[PDB]
Design a protein around this ligand. Structure first.
Ligand SMILES: CCCCCCCCCCCCCCCCCC(=O)OC[C@H](COP(=O)([O-])OCC(O)COP(=O)([O-])OC[C@@H](COC(=O)CCCCCCCCCCCCCCCCC)OC(=O)CCCCCCCCCCCCCCCCC)OC(=O)CCCCCCCCCCCCCCCCC
Ligand SMILES: CCCCCCCCCCCCCCCCCC(=O)OC[C@H](COP(=O)([O-])OCC[N+](C)(C)C)OC(=O)CCCCCCCCCCCCCCCCC
Ligand SMILES: NC(=O)C1=CN([C@@H]2O[C@H](COP(=O)(O)OP(=O)(O)OC[C@H]3O[C@@H](n4cnc5c(N)ncnc54)[C@H](OP(=O)(O)O)[C@@H]3O)[C@@H](O)[C@H]2O)C=CC1
Ligand code: SF4
Ligand code: SF4
Ligand code: SF4
Ligand code: SF4
Ligand code: SF4
Ligand SMILES: [K+]
Ligand SMILES: [Zn+2]
Lengths: 45, 238, 115, 155, 55, 145, 96, 60, 48, 176, 209, 342, 42
């Protein structure tokens, strides 16, 4: 019986992500302002 | 677990895979932390520009670790004084520009990502080898050899009565703790027991800075100073 | 080798000097420490407590040590003035709970093998 | 019957108190962190009463976690008297139980019994986080076997 | 795992991330708790010859 | 000494010679240093023990069964470098690190032999013959130990 | 075999038995002493004696590494069945 | 303006007992030194002791 | 255990107890050693 | 190698200022924080249902000392007292005596539960694997005295568990 | 160093500290008694008591030494030696990644002018020394009992101070307050005589003194 | 002494003094202090408890490991006593209810149980017994407090030949319901006491002086049979208590000499509350009655315990009643009461 | 050789008052020395 201690597989392991991957979600700066003004004008009317 | 002369026990079968399972997903949770804390204006305006400390004042106050690196100082124990195999692994040292509580907070979370990198390399670098030194005068002989051979019986017997005979002298072997610089002044008379072991407390100097980091600042900033220092009441109090 | 470095007391008088205002401050200290700390101790037995402490150690003649108790007594006073010390600490000097240790050889004998 | 009436009232009061303790944290050492994992979702305690109201005045049971020091001795004690009854204290870990690993030391009083009346003892160094949940549960059943209104009826 | 589809897209949208790809609870990737006998290696100096403690 | 073993064969076990209700013999542990036989014939001046056998099978003992009975018979226990000869009454009672040796003198004889007391936790376990040369050297008789 | 004292106090294998006059018996009423009923003296006594035809017999005690160190047992005493100090298992030399 | 972080409220004379114990029994003190990063303290103690001992740990 | 019964042995408890504390089945510490300082048991009858 | 952290530069162009002004007025990173928590609301909890659900452990768990016995029946502890010497808290109190049979047996084996630390040193001490730390943690008490264990309790604990701890050391003595 | 048991030695820096040790020794020979290095590449230069100011002011300000990181202010009691208290400094050089260590000798009474000027980190350490070992330091801004209990007696790390201490504490009902009675241990510290009477290391053996 | 009953130690917590003082009904006032004194030098004080263990929990800290052995007991059960005093080498009685209960007729609390524990203790094989009587114990007095005390006092005297009976005066302490009582007329009303206080002289005694008396009586062998009276240092006419107590607490002094006729009515109305009879008809004439000198029986002064003056320690019990504006006031600001005494 | 206002201390040093040991533990404590006798079995 040869060495049987806990060993990683010969290919090591799956490449594990470690970067900061904050997904940029949102809307255009003017788009947010435009839709805000549009609702106000509709509400006023 | 980590004992003088190696490590006590061996890794249980399959655990390295479980470490990979945890590591593969822990990056997601830190994206959750940074999104929740870093970007939010409440976290910045309450914690940024709070408790600043100049580089010369920081270092000359005996500060270490996140105290120095966050406050501009360019120094890390593993990169500069390579102890153990830390030289072989690769990582980055996330130093800061200003050095307030927020900058230290970001320095901590970037070291977390860097910690994941070090975990990745070492876990794939696991060797075939024994867990403790092949010197029965410092390392306990194997339990199979315990009940098989006389030398092993004596060596474990004496190691478990008085321990091992440490050559006299003194040292200040110091490594970076995840909080700061942790060291010990272990002076040995030469018997089987230590003579005097003064433990460097990484927060000992860090808690000394509470005077100025809270000076000129609000009362609520005091706990912010403590929080970004992460004062743990086991070392500053021996 | 008899000639050694002194701390503050170059002579006996300066050691006698520092003891003076130390008692001056401490004599002015007893009535209020009782008052703020809500100690059920009258001022009088607070004052002479400082008194017999003062000559419980006023026998040594070395000038290097006498001023060391001066600063030790000096700073035991500082810790008291600013409510750092609590009720247990002030009372701790006022020994209460233990029975008087034996006085005659009859009492040493009756308690136990202790001398 | 009268004994039934005092039994129903005893159950109503006991069931309320045992099921909704409001512990106040007095962690001093590594015994604090492992109880503080009971707050972590793995062994959630807020599932049964014990909640974040804290405010040592608004507290039923006090958990003394970690080593107890002589300079810590009076300040911990005066907290206990200010703690309104029914007040019970939980002894966390070998250090708070009887001094543990620092029993022969000058800056630690061996055990919390010398200071406060300990109602329950949880061994460990540190006790596993779930083991305290058991200790809280066994304290909960300890309240269940209380006869305050029953003993008053006998009087 | 667990959850249903329409819930997943709800939390996928609110977090801006694909949580189903990797989660924070172990379901089946965990290694089997019982494991084969771990035959450990020997010491580097484990040899019947030329291994005196004089060296 | 080394830090491992190189022995793969079996061992040898010796029959325990039974002598005295005061000294215990485990002859398998004997290293055949013969210190017992010399401290017997020269010091005690009595013929009691031998080295019966030859080679690996030579054994320290009396051949024919006896009971070695000298006044200073309780001294070979200390001269024995191993536990081949041990003290029966103190046997299996206390161990070195527990004991806090305290020195005194013997009273059972007018000699006043310097001795070492072995209090462990509030009671006396064994008596050691403190070395002083003139009064008792480092040997004490049985009635004192 | 656990034995009881005159006051009904069962004795332990060490032999401790608090007498009636002992004030230290008051912790015993309303509660109990835990007594290891399996008295270690007589779960070895009933164990038989194995027969091995050799002058020296190993005494690993089974279980391989799970046991006691293999102290070798001398077997030449006809009047004394050689037992192991570790495990107490009596070993015997065939009756010549 | 002025801050004094008084300490001692947890103080244990850790190295006072370290003197009376040997190195192996001293090891659990270090794990209890920092109750957050425990094994890092074990790392410092083990490095210091095996630095004096002139013995290096195996690569595994 | 239905698929793997534990190693059956004589001294193993045949019935697993719960936490006996609180019940009259608690545990009480007591010396398991024997007294080693016996008195003189003064004999009776005569007078000096 | 190294890396800064707070070295991002804010762009002064019309586009960049608009997003920052929109972020300040129309709180978006705050809403991003809201979305993070809400997505977690619909995330299943990980609350183990004690006592019915119990947290995972490993075959190496340390707690609740219990002397074992040989397959014959005699207890393992030969009073070799390495556990006493090793015990870093001196919680062990062992007094030896020659038993009537002749082999040793401890007449006094008290380990003070509230001095012990469950470091697992004691099992590594005795070469007869006499004392081990079992898998129990469910021995919280209400009086300080019952924590003070003795030889009788230790044997009773050993006889109580034995079978569970019998397999534990069988699956772990290879590592040791 | 083909054998993996012993740690390899490093000679290139080993000679470097000795060269730097002589470099410091020649500059200020008025205060350096003796300088030496150990096997584990740790140099120590030994200073006279009244030398706390300039030697550290040297290492803190020298363009070729510039040791500014104050590591620890330890003390080591040696009852045999007349100046039993041995105050030990420790400095780290940021640019030259080295660890200097200077230590002095001091009696119970003899002071040391506070080195808070060269390193204000010593200030908070300085409180501990007078608490922990009891050595008073001259002209110290505020040298306070900061880590031991309030109103403690003596210095616990003097090797004449019992491990258990002198006073134990308990809550007393008749005073409704914690009273400090003299210690009365439930169990006595079972000291262990752990000293093999055979020679441990022929290398570091003390010759007949 | 018995093999293990022999004393040992320096009087610490873990020092065996060899006195096994099973105290009866220690869950209140004097029980709390005596066990505190009993546990100081170390003693197996077996306290039979009958209430909820929670209320007895606070007796635990004043005992070493395995010292305060709470034991379940009931007054009616004959075997209840026999189990708790079987091994106790000394028995300290403290049973008695200063107020009244329907199930506990006032005869019982000083006649039935005190006799019900004295005879079992003498049958068990004890050495000593201390039943606490009253300094004014007198059956012929209209005080049921005194009426039940005296008859029970001689019963245990007759039953137990070595019954060292203690007759303390009106003890005062943190929970004496005597000082905190006398502060409570301000809360209740206009001090409805009788004759403005100029009809009753009493001699209060500080509890520690009392409790030190029993333990000193424990070590004293000649105390058997002798009936010691525990008396304070000075007497005090009843009016002096009222003005001094209202002074050391800074309370609005509103004295009123309400005669005994109407003051007896308020006693029953205080018993009306079916939770605790704040004041009883027994307590009506209890304070009106004055303390007899009783000079022939020996006192604690010859026993080695001196007497602490009342005015030496009043706010230690009365600072609680002092309002926030005057909680800081000590004795010195307050004039001492007129020492109407010997 | 150390000339800074040195005081010619001719009386033997007595630091007993600084260490603050209890008074019953400085007089009623015979303190003794000797060099341990070798353990005769070793
Ligand atoms: C408000 C929204 C509408 C009501 C709730 C809808 C809901 O729960 O849908 C199921 C499910 C619950 O959330 P999930 O995370 O998808 O569940 C994952 C597992 O299937 C969950 O696995 P599981 O094992 O929990 O599945 C069984 C579960 C299934 O439970 C249900 O389906 C909930 C309704 C039970 C009736 O039932 C139980 O566990 C039995 C105990 C039920 C506890 C009490 C439920 C009260 C519901 C409201 C009552 C009125 C107020 O939601 C959906 O399928 C879509 C979201 C809701 C859409 C509603 C319509 C628009
Ligand atoms: C069933 C339950 C359905 C509803 C669930 C909750 C919906 C609301 C919370 C989640 C909203 C989306 C989360 C998200 O993507 O956030 C990040 C995103 C983007 O956050 P951001 O901080 O990255 O901004 C990116 C865009 N720039 C750079 C230009 C600023 O949030 C938004 O886009 C929010 C837009 C609306 C904000 C409205 C605030 C004012 C409201 C006034 C009263 C009306
Ligand atoms: N000034 C004074 O008050 C003086 C009082 N005394 C007498 O001293 C005794 C003790 O005084 P003190 O400690 O202040 O009183 P407390 O009311 O504070 O305590 C009385 C004790 O008696 C116990 N007790 C009484 N009757 C019973 C019963 N039937 N069954 C069980 N327990 C019972 C109570 O137990 P539980 O709490 O469970 O009911 C309690 O422990 C009383 O008899 C008192 O009258 C003597 C001289 C002066
Ligand atoms: S019992 Fe153990 S874990 Fe708890 S405080 Fe003490 S040493 Fe730390
Ligand atoms: S002294 Fe001991 S080891 Fe030496 S020969 Fe005699 S029995 Fe054998
Ligand atoms: S202790 Fe010494 S004599 Fe005894 S068995 Fe071990 S090696 Fe042999
Ligand atoms: S686990 Fe450690 S502390 Fe506990 S009894 Fe074993 S050796 Fe002693
Ligand atoms: S170490 Fe093991 S064999 Fe030795 S005394 Fe302790 S329990 Fe028994
Ligand atoms: K020998
Ligand atoms: Zn065997």
């Amino acid at each position: 019986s040869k060495v049987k201690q806990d060993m990683p597989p010969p290919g090591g392991y799956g490449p594990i992500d470690y970067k900061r991957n904050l997904p940029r979600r949102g809307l255009s700066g003017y788009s947010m302002f435009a839709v805000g003004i549009g609702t106000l004008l509709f509400g006023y009317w | 677990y980590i004992r003088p002369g190696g490590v006590h026990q061996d890794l249980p079968l399959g655990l390295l895979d479980d470490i990979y399972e945890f590591s593969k997903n822990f990056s997601f949770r830190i994206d959750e932390l940074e999104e929740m804390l870093t970007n939010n204006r409440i976290w910045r305006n309450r914690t940024v520009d709070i408790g600043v400390v100049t580089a010369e004042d920081a270092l000359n106050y005996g500060f270490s670790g996140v105290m120095l690196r966050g406050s501009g100082i360019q120094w890390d124990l593993r990169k500069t004084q390579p102890y153990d195999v830390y030289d072989q692994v690769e990582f980055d040292v996330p130093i800061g520009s200003r050095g307030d509580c927020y900058d230290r907070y970001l320095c901590r979370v970037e070291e977390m990502r860097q910690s994941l990198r070090i975990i990745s390399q070492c876990l794939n670098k696991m060797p075939p080898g024994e867990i403790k030194v092949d010197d029965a005068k410092v390392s306990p002989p194997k339990r199979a050899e315990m009940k098989t051979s006389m030398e092993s019986l004596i060596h474990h017997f004496k190691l478990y009565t008085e321990g091992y005979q440490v050559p006299p002298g003194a040292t200040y072997t110091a490594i970076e703790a995840p909080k700061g610089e942790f060291g010990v002044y272990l002076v040995s008379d030469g018997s089987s027991r230590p003579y005097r072991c003064k433990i460097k407390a990484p927060g000992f100097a860090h808690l000394a800075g509470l005077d100025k980091m809270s000076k000129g600042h609000m009362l609520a900033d005091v706990v912010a100073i403590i929080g970004t220092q992460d004062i743990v009441f086991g070392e500053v109090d021996r | 080798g008899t000639s050694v470095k002194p701390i503050f007391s170059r002579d006996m008088n300066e050691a006698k000097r520092r003891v003076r205002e130390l008692y001056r401050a401490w004599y002015r200290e007893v009535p209020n420490t009782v008052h703020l700390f809500q100690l059920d101790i009258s001022v009088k037995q607070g004052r002479d407590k400082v008194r017999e402490m003062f000559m419980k150690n006023a026998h040594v003649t070395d000038p290097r040590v006498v001023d060391l108790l001066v600063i030790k007594g000096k700073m035991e006073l500082e810790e008291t003035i600013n409510v750092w010390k609590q009720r247990t600490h002030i009372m701790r000097f006022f020994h209460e709970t233990e029975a008087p240790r034996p006085t005659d050889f009859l009492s040493k004998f009756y308690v136990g093998h202790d001398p | 019957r009268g004994e039934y009436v005092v039994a129903k009232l005893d159950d109503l009061v006991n069931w309320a108190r045992r099921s909704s303790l409001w512990p106040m944290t007095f962690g001093l050492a590594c015994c604090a962190v492992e109880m503080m994992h009971m707050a972590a979702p793995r062994y959630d305690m807020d599932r049964f009463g014990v909640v974040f109201r804290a405010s040592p005045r608004q507290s039923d049971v006090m958990i003394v976690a970690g080593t107890l020091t002589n300079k810590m001795a009076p300040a911990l004690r005066k907290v206990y008297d200010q703690m309104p009854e029914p007040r019970y204290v939980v002894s966390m870990g070998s250090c708070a139980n009887g001094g543990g690993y620092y029993h022969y030391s000058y800056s630690v009083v061996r055990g919390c019994d010398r200071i406060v009346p300990v109602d329950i003892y949880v061994p460990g160094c540190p006790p596993t986080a779930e083991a305290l949940l058991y200790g809280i549960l066994q304290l909960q059943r300890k309240i269940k076997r209380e006869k305050r209104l029953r003993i008053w009826y006998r009087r | 795992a667990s959850a249903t589809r329409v819930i997943q897209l709800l939390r996928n949208w609110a977090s801006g991330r694909d949580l189903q790809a990797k989660l924070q609870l172990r379901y089946q990737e965990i290694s089997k708790r019982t494991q084969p006998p771990p035959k450990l290696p020997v010491g580097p100096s484990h040899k019947l010859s030329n291994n005196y403690y004089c060296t | 000494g080394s830090d491992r073993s190189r022995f793969l064969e079996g061992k040898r076990a010796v029959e325990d010679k039974n002598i005295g209700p005061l000294v215990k013999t485990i002859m398998t542990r004997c290293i055949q240093c013969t210190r017992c036989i010399r401290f017997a014939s020269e010091i005690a001046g009595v013929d009691d023990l031998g080295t019966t056998g030859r080679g690996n099978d030579m054994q320290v003992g009396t051949y024919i069964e006896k009971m070695f009975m000298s006044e200073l018979s309780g001294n070979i226990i200390d001269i024995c470098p191993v536990g081949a000869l041990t003290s029966k009454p103190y046997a299996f009672t206390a161990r070195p690190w527990e004991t806090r040796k305290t020195e005194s003198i013997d009273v059972m004889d007018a000699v006043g032999s310097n001795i070492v007391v072995s209090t462990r936790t509030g009671e006396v376990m064994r008596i050691l013959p403190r070395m002083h040369e003139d009064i008792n050297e480092e040997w004490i008789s049985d009635k004192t130990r | 075999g656990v034995r009881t004292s005159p006051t009904g106090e069962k004795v332990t294998h060490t032999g401790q038995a608090y007498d009636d006059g002992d004030y230290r018996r008051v912790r015993f009423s309303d509660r109990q002493k835990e007594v290891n009923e399996n008295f270690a003296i007589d779960l070895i006594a009933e164990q038989p004696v194995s027969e091995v035809g050799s002058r020296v017999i190993s005494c690993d005690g089974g279980g391989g590494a799970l046991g006691h160190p293999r102290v070798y047992i001398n077997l030449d005493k006809e009047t004394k069945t050689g037992t192991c100090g570790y495990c107490g298992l009596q070993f015997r030399q065939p009756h010549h | 303006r002025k801050c004094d972080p008084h300490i001692g409220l947890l103080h244990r004379g850790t190295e006072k007992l370290i003197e009376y114990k040997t190195y192996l029994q001293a090891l659990p003190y270090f794990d209890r030194l920092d109750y957050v990063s425990m094994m890092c303290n074990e790392q410092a103690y083990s490095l210091a002791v095996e630095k004096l001992l002139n013995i290096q740990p195996p690569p595994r | 255990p239905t698929t793997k019964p534990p190693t059956a042995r004589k001294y193993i408890w045949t019935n697993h107890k719960f936490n006996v504390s609180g019940t009259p089945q608690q545990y009480v510490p007591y010396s398991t050693t024997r007294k080693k300082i016996q008195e003189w048991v003064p004999p009776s009858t005569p007078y000096k | 190698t190294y890396k800064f952290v707070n070295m991002r530069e804010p762009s002064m162009d019309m586009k960049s200022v608009t997003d920052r002004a929109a972020q300040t007025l129309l709180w978006t990173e705050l809403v991003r924080g809201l979305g993070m928590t809400l997505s977690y609301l619909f995330r299943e909890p990980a609350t183990i249902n004690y006592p019915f659900e119990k947290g995972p452990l490993s075959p190496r768990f340390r707690g609740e000392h219990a002397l074992r016995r040989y397959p014959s029946g005699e207890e393992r502890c030969i009073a070799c007292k390495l556990c006493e010497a090793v015990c870093p808290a001196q919680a062990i109190t062992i007094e030896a005596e020659p038993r009537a049979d002749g082999s040793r047996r401890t007449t006094r084996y008290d380990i003070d539960m509230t001095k012990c630390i469950y470091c697992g040193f004691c099992q590594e001490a005795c070469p007869v694997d006499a004392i081990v730390e079992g898998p129990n943690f469910e021995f919280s008490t209400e009086t300080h005295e019952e924590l003070l264990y003795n030889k009788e309790k230790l044997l009773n604990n050993g006889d109580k568990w034995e079978a569970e701890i019998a397999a534990n050391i069988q699956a772990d003595y290879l590592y040791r | 160093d083909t054998r993996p048991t012993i740690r390899p030695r490093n000679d290139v820096v080993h000679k470097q500290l000795s060269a730097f040790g002589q470099y410091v020794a020649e500059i200020l020979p008025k205060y350096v008694q003796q300088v030496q290095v150990s096997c584990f590449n740790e140099l120590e230069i030994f200073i006279h008591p009244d030398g706390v100011i300039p030697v550290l002011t040297f290492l803190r300000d020298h363009t070729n030494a510039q040791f500014k990181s104050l590591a620890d202010l330890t003390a080591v009691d040696v009852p045999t030696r007349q100046n039993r208290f041995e105050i030990v400094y420790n400095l780290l050089s940021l640019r030259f990644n080295s660890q200097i260590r200077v230590k002095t000798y001091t009696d119970e009474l003899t002071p040391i002018e506070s080195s808070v000027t060269v390193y204000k980190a010593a200030n908070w350490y300085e409180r501990e020394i007078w608490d922990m070992f009891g050595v008073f330091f001259a002209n110290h801004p505020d040298l306070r009992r900061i880590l031991t209990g309030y109103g403690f007696e003596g210095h616990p790390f003097r090797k004449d101070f019992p491990l258990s201490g002198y006073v134990e504490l308990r809550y007393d009902d008749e005073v409704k307050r914690v009273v400090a009675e003299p210690v009365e241990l439930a169990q006595e510290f079972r000291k262990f005589d752990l000293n093999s009477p055979w020679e441990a290391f022929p290398a570091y053996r003390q010759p007949p003194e | 002494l018995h093999h293990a009953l022999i004393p040992h130690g320096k009087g610490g917590r873990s020092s065996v003094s060899g006195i096994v003082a099973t105290v009866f009904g220690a869950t209140g006032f004097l029980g709390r202090y005596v066990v505190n004194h009993l546990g100081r030098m170390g003693s197996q004080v077996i306290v039979p408890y009958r209430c909820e263990p929670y209320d007895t929990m606070h007796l635990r800290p004043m005992g070493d490991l395995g010292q305060i052995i709470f034991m379940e007991w009931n007054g009616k059960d004959k075997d209840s006593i026999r189990k708790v005093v079987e091994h106790s080498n000394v028995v300290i009685n403290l049973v008695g209810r200063e107020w009244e209960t329907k199930n506990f007729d006032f005869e019982d609390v000083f006649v039935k149980i005190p006799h019900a524990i004295a005879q079992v203790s003498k049958e068990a094989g004890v050495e000593k017994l201390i039943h606490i009587s009253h300094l004014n114990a007198d059956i012929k007095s209209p005080s049921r407090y005194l009426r039940s005390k005296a008859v029970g006092e001689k019963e245990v005297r007759a039953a137990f030949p070595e019954a060292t009976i203690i007759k303390p005066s009106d003890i005062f302490g943190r929970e004496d319901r005597f000082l905190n009582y006398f502060a409570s007329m301000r809360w209740f009303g206009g001090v409805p006491l009788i004759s403005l206080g100029k009809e009753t002289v009493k001699q209060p005694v500080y509890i520690v002086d009392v409790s030190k008396g029993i333990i000193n009586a424990i070590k004293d062998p000649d105390a058997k049979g002798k009936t010691f009276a525990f008396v304070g240092p000075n007497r005090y006419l009843l009016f002096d208590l009222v003005q001094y107590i209202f002074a050391v607490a800074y309370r609005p002094f509103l004295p009123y000499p309400l005669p005994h006729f109407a003051y007896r009515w308020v006693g029953r109305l205080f018993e009306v509350s079916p939770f605790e009879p704040w004041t009883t008809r027994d307590k009506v004439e209890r304070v009106h009655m004055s303390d007899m000198t009783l000079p022939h029986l020996p006192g604690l002064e010859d026993l080695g315990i001196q007497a602490t003056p009342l005015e030496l320690k009043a706010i230690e019990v009365l600072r609680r009643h002092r309002t926030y504006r005057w909680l800081t006031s000590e004795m010195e600001d307050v004039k001492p009461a007129k020492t109407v005494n010997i | 050789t150390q000339d800074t206002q040195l005081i010619a201390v001719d009386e033997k040093l007595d630091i007993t008052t600084l260490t603050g040991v209890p008074e019953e533990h400085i007089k009623t404590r015979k303190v003794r020395i000797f060099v341990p006798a070798r353990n005769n079995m070793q």
